[PDB]
Amino acid sequence: KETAAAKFERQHMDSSTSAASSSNYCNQMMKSRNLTKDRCKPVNTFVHESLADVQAVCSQKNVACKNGQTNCYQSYSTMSITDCRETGSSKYPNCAYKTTQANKHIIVACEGNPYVPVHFDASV
């Protein structure tokens, strides 16, 4: 089955764009990354950075996750991110999202050897 690291990349990485280019970014990416296949994922963030730069966060500022786990890390630097959250009209299978561009620090949980992101905890 898909590894947790691989799921993070699929759900949260978009190294192919610098920022969201239109209001339909989230609608397209949520669909393309299969985040709307079974149900509308209600909120999701994409990170517009290289994979190596995001993986490197696992060596940055340790901080407890929202759920209290201690394997979370905050990036030293802000990153270009897109926040995707369901619109009030979103109704499976016609999932609809509001796209919000931001530059924020990210908080990720890390696991494994190599020690890499497996969960996107927050933008801050």
3-state DSSP assignment of residue 58:
helix
Number of H-type helices and E-type strands within the chain: 3, 7
Annotated ligand binding at 93? The verdict is: no
Find the CATH number of the domain harbouring 82.
3.10.130.10
In the set 9, 12, 79, 123, the catalytic residue is 12
Alpha helices in the chain (DSSP H): 4-12, 25-32, 51-55
Annotated ligand binding at 85? The verdict is: yes
Q: Are 46 and 28 in contact (CB under 8 A)?
A: no
Q: Is 119 marked active-site?
A: yes
Number of Cβ within a 10 Å radius of residue 33: 18
37: β partners: none
Q: Are 117 and 54 in contact (CB under 8 A)?
A: yes
Q: Are 81 and 48 in contact (CB under 8 A)?
A: yes
Place of tokens 């016609």: 94
Method for this entry: X-ray
Q: Are strands 79-86 and 43-47 parallel, antiparallel or unpaired?
A: antiparallel
Residue numbers of the domain that contains 25: 1-124
Number of domains in the chain: 1
